[PDB]
Design a protein around this ligand. Structure first.
Ligand SMILES: COc1cccc(-c2cc(C(F)(F)F)[nH]n2)c1
Ligand SMILES: COc1cccc(-c2cc(C(F)(F)F)[nH]n2)c1
Lengths: 791, 235, 216, 158
């Protein structure tokens, strides 16, 4: 909402400077978005009248004018194409200071003496109209300072209103606030009823009184629409960002911006048998004044005649029914439209007007009549004509009524954290035009005025009090709490814990978009229908991710392309699995690595990262809550991963996730030339662990034996290590695979597994006989299960 | 053709924390989550902070060389973390909500007792504190700590620094796990806190005792040997 | 992590919810009527007529109010989505929302909480300003400003708050006669930008190592 | 009853490396946490701190527990060799605690973080090199700790 401060101050003057007013406005809930001067600075410019012009005898592009300042006649040489006798113009006398340090001096232009200058709006920084001289009204006061006359000592304040303050969408609304804020008298425009000059009316039917409980109509005969909109109105509308279009639209707009009542004028000749305020028929067609052809719905209120729809009630008028050049007679409309009945209707047709906005936000249900009289007077003043009587059609049953609210002083004190005096409460509420009647000790019955659509509860009253008292003047307290000692279980690996572990393990944390390109989704998840957005921002952001991998891989190659060799990233977040019916939204921890195993350094080996580097990272995470043993890495397969280098991770047979090298075919497709290692874990299966269960420490020595085992190259190492543990007896304290050999010293389809076996008895020393015995049973077990051999 | 198996991962893996450290962290968390500040103090203390300020008279048996480690006549190794709560009471005015974990020393050593150990002490000093407030605090702490809705028993006991005082038991037919009580008027008075305006409660617990109950540790001496075969069990 | 710590240390529980939400939890339960412009496809990402990507973490606070009776002290950090995207705004971002519902909660309690949180967060005894605003879910409501002591390279809007609306409680079976409450909301990226001197919001989702490496 | 409290949101500064943070870092870096007695043997004290008079107890429990430590090193080294003698090859330990520096008049009681390592650089494994730990392995551990609060540049190893 934009407005001229001068015009506001003409209703309620706060007696504080501009800067003070703009400051307070935001502090009371009317946030100022802009405050700008209406024009540039200048002095010595008065209203001048051209008495005569003559052709300059030595320059055809110039004229020799005689101009009066109401006190004296001066000869001014002018080159503007519009300079003519009778014209009221800004006369800059010798001595006048114009913008950008332009001092008017005496001149002898082509042998002719000039005692001043005549100005354009541009020259004075009024408008950008340098086409010619700023032509002032025929009735301008000759001699008066142009800044005084044109009210140039002014600012335009723009307020970013909240949807609850529809009442502030006018000068009437904003001035009421100022009067409340500053406890200063409110002087609203006195609107005298315009007397009917004739008896011509048109009947009005309220076929939908629930959507329009009040409608006012007036016949205005023999209007001259060739006449111009006066300057004061153009300036007032302009200072509210309303561009002048035509005298009749300008008045209905002016009344709306002045009082808050949207109004509409029809060409009386286009009304067949009076007005019918009714719902549209399903598929009823109406061409708007902007040319848009709307196909209406039965839920939409229209202003119609007895033949057809004329306008979409409270939003926009039709082309046919509206004023044209041929218009000689008018039918003025000022109505109240229910906010509920109008909510979202303009939007549903892709429309938004100053009228639709005000009606949706709420228009004072009692205002139509004051608005009608005001617009009648303005129409007669601007375009003439003869008014008939006002036709008021009202439905008492459907008028908006808010029950009085009981306000309790204790509830104010409680909420504000301090008591307010009864006089202060009453003063404040009464300034907002609320009806405050005492209802015993520290209680009142308060009534809501017709312009306020946000006040229905006791808390809304307290809000008004806090607002006008000053939010920053209110006390500060910290809320009381009966708090008891508490904690989460000890044996759990939380995500903040795991993140820091990955940081320590040399990872950088990435955050990627949850919605990806459907084509990228398809690469990592072939054959799965992603959960696709109906209104995506772009088409490459349409698919909800089922893996953090596409996003991580993408961030990894973003870096690779940015002169990065070693990229170690991790992300945590939700995955979206299935369609809405059965959708699983699970938190995942995923990681992606590439480049050298170690950073570049004098002390570091130049080996590249591999599967077993990523494996250690997964192992470290999986061991974070002392439950590493609960997990198993089994040879698995995943479409995004290399089938020869993929591990399916499980816990009690349940799937935890996957670890592997990104599939070489996927890499090709993404133009990735470096090997990349991925892992993804379902956090729900990682968080639980086990509390330490102490096992007694032996006072006796441990005994170690080393075994070199020849096995088929394809038999898994963990299958052997598991068989060994099962055959080692009760005293085995440690089993270590310290080497793997797949060289020339043995068969090309076999491998040697060098293992270290440690045993410790809790109550004595172990003898060589029993240990050699246990060792042989391990071997025998491996001979029968894997056809193993000692090296 | 470039296939591989599911052998162990390469490099270094995580170590771990000491079971006492785990236990202190856990005790602190139960209170820090509800407004308690962690307070620390020196281990080499004076007679005033360690005894006098805590209503322990000069002739009291706790002061003797049979129980307290001394450097000279007035300087000692602190027998409790209570002096930290004293230094806090002297430094500031109520409200006070603190937990004081730390190393404490006692001359009585052999099996069931070590010359050095850890304990966490608590203190809350405000305008309207009661014994009901103390019971609530302790019962909820133990439940939180042992992750069970266990039965908590309060038995009348004695301490020079508190009145009334209690020994706190939990099931498993009961086990004593901590002590508490309402701060003694003389303790507050000595530290410039008006006992007419302010009431308070304090509590004390041994970290090793709690760790032993939690982890099933039988011998208290395992805590100071630092055998990797012991330590490794708390990874 | 930092925002959560300011509250978790004083009894606030961390609450999490789904990112794919329903109209009830995301709008209806928060006093946002069916005809409200926030619901439109110009601002909200939809899957179908009733299923969407959450516009805020407020639904998490709703799910909490339905599940339990007061006292409630929660902080709700999480990924949120908005259809309005260009510079200054991203289609995905993070925000932390707070809720406290107890027997005698006031606007003075809210002011105290917010002012101390900002001071704690920005590690300065900065000036905090409360300006009246509007939200369908709160009444009274405020936009919270802090000085330019953390630069624009003389006030900055950093967060919003308000007293929970009676209808919001009522809808989630909390008696507004017995219980009062306050809620607050803040954008994580806006706060991070103020804290670390980050000028362009787009650096947050590119994951350039030259950006990321600066926060080690 | 549960005591009522007017509690306000609060936090410690962001850019600080607290001891619980550093402990976990050392854990991730392959260290085991030890807790050693604050009072050591005067002879051990003399080995690590030549020429300094320890703050000696008047009534020590034993004579080999008479000196207040001025370093966590004698205790850590002792726990390390305790293990070495108990069939352990790779011993990686850290401790945090007070040091006692000076006599009563002027005594400084400062919190320290100390670490001690020996054996192979890496644990025994098929994929791991059999090189023994050296200075630069311990250096990386100190570097990682010193960089924990984004201030590594503030430190110099001379
Ligand atoms: C078993 O330990 C306990 C048991 C009961 C009370 C206390 C206690 C009291 C105080 C102080 F300083 F506030 F008075 N500190 N500690 C300690
Ligand atoms: C700036 O964001 C904000 C600001 C103020 C209040 C809230 C809010 C309120 C609620 C609930 F669920 F309690 F009603 N959730 N979130 C959010």
């Amino acid at each position: 909402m934009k407005f001229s401060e001068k015009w506001l101050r003409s209703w309620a003057n706060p007696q504080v400077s501009h800067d003070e007013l703009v400051a307070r406005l935001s502090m009371v809930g009317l946030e100022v978005d802009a405050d700008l001067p209406v024009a540039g600075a200048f002095s010595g410019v008065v209203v001048g009248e051209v008495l005569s012009t003559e052709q300059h005898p030595d320059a055809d592009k110039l004229r020799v004018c005689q101009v009066s300042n109401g006190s004296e006649t001066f000869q001014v040489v002018c080159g503007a194409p519009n300079v003519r006798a009778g014209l009221k113009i800004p006369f800059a006398m010798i001595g006048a200071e114009l913008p950008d340090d332009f001092k008017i001096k005496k001149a002898k232009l082509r042998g002719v003496e000039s005692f001043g200058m005549l100005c354009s709006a541009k020259e004075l920084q009024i408008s950008e109209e340098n086409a010619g001289l700023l032509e002032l009204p025929a009735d301008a006061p000759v001699g008066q300072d142009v800044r005084t006359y044109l009210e140039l000592a002014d600012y335009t304040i723009e307020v970013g209103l909240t949807p609850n303050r529809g009442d502030c969408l006018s000068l009437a609304g904003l001035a009421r606030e100022v009067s409340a804020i500053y406890d200063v008298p409110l002087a609203p425009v006195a609107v005298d009823a315009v007397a009917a000059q004739h008896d011509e009316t048109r009947p009005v039917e309220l076929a939908a009184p629930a959507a329009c409980p009040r409608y006012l109509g007036r016949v205005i005969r023999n209007v001259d629409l060739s006449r111009p909109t006066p300057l004061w109105m153009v300036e007032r509308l302009r200072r509210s960002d309303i561009r002048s279009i035509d005298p009749v639209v300008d008045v209905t707009n002016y009344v709306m911006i002045e009082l808050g009542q949207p109004m509409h004028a029809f060409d009386l000749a286009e009304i067949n048998g009076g007005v019918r305020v009714r719902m549209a028929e399903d598929g009823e067609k109406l061409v708007l004044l902007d040319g848009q052809e709307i196909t209406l719905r039965a839920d939409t209120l229209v202003i119609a005649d007895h033949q057809r729809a004329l306008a979409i009630a409270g939003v926009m008028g039709g082309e046919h029914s509206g004023v044209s050049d041929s218009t000689r007679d008018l039918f003025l409309e000022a109505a109240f439209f229910d906010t509920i009945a109008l909510a979202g209707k303009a939007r549903s047709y892709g429309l938004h007007t100053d009228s639709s906005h005000r009606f949706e936000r709420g228009v004072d249900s009692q205002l139509a009549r004051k608005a009608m009289e005001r617009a009648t007077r303005l129409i007669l003043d601007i375009v003439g004509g003869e008014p008939g009587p006002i036709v008021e059609q009202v439905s008492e049953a459907h008028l908006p009524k808010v029950a009085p609210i009981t306000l309790r002083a204790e509830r104010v004190t409680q909420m504000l954290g301090m008591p307010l005096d009864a006089a202060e409460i009453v003063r404040l509420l009464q300034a907002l035009e609320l009806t405050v009647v005492a209802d015993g000790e520290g209680q009142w019955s308060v009534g809501v005025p017709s312009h306020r659509f946000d006040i229905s509860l006791e808390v809304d009253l307290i809000e008004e009090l806090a607002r006008l008292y000053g939010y920053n003047r209110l006390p500060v307290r910290y809320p009381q709490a009966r708090l008891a000692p508490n904690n989460k279980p000890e044996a759990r690996a939380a995500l903040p814990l795991l993140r820091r572990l990955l940081v320590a393990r040399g990872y950088q944390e990435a955050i990627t978009f949850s919605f990806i390109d459907p084509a990228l989704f398809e690469l990592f998840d072939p054959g799965t229908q992603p959960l696709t957005l109906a209104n995506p921002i772009s088409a490459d952001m349409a698919a909800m991710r089922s893996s953090l991998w596409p996003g991580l891989v993408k961030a990894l190659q973003h870096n690779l392309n940015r002169q990065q060799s070693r990229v170690r990233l991790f992300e945590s977040g939700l995955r979206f699995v299935g369609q809405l019916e059965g959708l699983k939204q699970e938190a995942m921890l995923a990681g992606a690595i590439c480049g050298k195993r170690l950073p570049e350094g004098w002390a570091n080996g130049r080996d590249g990262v591999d599967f077993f580097d990523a494996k250690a990272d997964v192992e470290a995470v999986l061991a974070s809550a002392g439950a590493l043993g609960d997990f198993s890495f089994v040879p698995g397969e995943h479409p995004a991963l290399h089938p020869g280098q993929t591990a399916r991770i499980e816990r009690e047979g349940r799937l935890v996730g996957y670890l592997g090298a990104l599939h070489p075919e996927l890499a090709k497709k993404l133009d990735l030339e470096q090997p990349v290692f991925l892992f993804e874990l379902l956090l729900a299966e990682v968080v639980d662990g086990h509390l330490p269960k102490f096992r007694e420490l032996s006072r006796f020595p441990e005994v170690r034996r080393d075994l070199a085992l020849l096995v088929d190259q394809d038999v898994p190492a963990q299958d052997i290590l598991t068989q060994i543990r099962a055959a080692a007896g009760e005293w085995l304290t440690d089993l270590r695979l310290f080497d793997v050999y797949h060289g020339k010293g043995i068969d090309p389809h076999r491998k040697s597994l060098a293992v270290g076996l440690t045993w410790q008895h809790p109550s004595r020393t172990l003898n060589d006989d029993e240990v050699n015995s246990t060792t042989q049973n391990i071997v025998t077990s491996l001979e029968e299960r894997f056809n193993a051999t000692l090296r | 053709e470039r296939i591989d198996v599911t052998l162990p991962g390469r490099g270094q893996l995580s170590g771990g924390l000491h079971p006492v450290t785990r236990t202190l962290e856990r005790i602190e968390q139960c209170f820090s989550r509800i407004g308690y500040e962690v307070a620390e103090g020196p281990e080499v203390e004076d007679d005033y902070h360690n005894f006098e300020a805590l209503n322990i008279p000069g002739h009291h048996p706790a002061r003797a060389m049979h129980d307290t480690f001394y450097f000279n006549a007035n300087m000692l190794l602190r027998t409790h973390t209570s002096p930290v709560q004293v230094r806090t009471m002297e430094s500031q005015q109520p409200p006070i909500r603190i937990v004081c974990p730390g190393r404490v020393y006692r001359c009585d050593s052999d099996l069931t007792h070590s010359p050095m150990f850890h304990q966490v002490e608590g203190l809350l000093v405000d305008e309207g504190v009661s014994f009901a407030d103390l019971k609530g605090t302790i019962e909820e702490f133990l439940r939180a700590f042992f992750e069970k809705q266990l039965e908590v028993r309060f038995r009348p006991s004695f301490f020079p620094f508190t009145e009334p005082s209690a020994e706190v038991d939990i099931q498993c037919g009961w086990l004593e796990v901590m002590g508490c009580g309402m701060v003694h008027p003389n303790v507050l008075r000595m530290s410039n806190i008006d006992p007419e305006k302010f009431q308070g409660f304090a509590f004390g617990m041994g970290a090793e005792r709690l760790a032993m109950l939690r982890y099933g540790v039988n011998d208290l001496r395992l805590f100071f040997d630092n055998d990797l075969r012991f330590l490794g069990q708390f990874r | 992590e930092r925002i959560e710590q300011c509250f978790s240390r004083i009894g606030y529980e961390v609450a999490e919810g789904p990112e794919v939400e329903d109209d009830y939890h995301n709008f209806e339960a928060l006093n946002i009527p069916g005809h409200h412009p926030a619901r439109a496809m110009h601002d909200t990402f939809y899957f179908n007529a009733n299923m969407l990507l959450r516009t805020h973490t407020s639904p998490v606070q709703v799910r909490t109010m339905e599940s339990q009776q007061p006292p409630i002290r929660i902080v709700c950090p999480g990924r949120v989505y908005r259809c309005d995207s260009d510079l200054t705004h991203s289609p995905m971002f993070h925000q932390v929302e707070g809720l406290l519902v107890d027997e005698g909660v006031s606007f003075a309690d809210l002011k105290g909480t917010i002012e101390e949180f900002l001071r704690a967060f920005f590690e300065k005894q900065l000036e905090v300003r409360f300006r009246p605003s509007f939200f369908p879910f709160t009444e009274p409501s405020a936009e919270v400003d802090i000085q330019c002591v953390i630069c624009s390279g003389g006030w900055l809007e950093v967060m919003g708050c308000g007293m929970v609306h009676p209808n919001v409680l009522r809808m989630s079976n909390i008696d507004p006669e017995k219980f009062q409450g306050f809620a607050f909301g803040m954008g994580a990226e806006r706060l991070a930008m103020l804290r670390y001197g980050v000028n362009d919001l787009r650096l947050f989702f590119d994951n350039d190592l030259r950006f990321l490496g600066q926060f080690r």
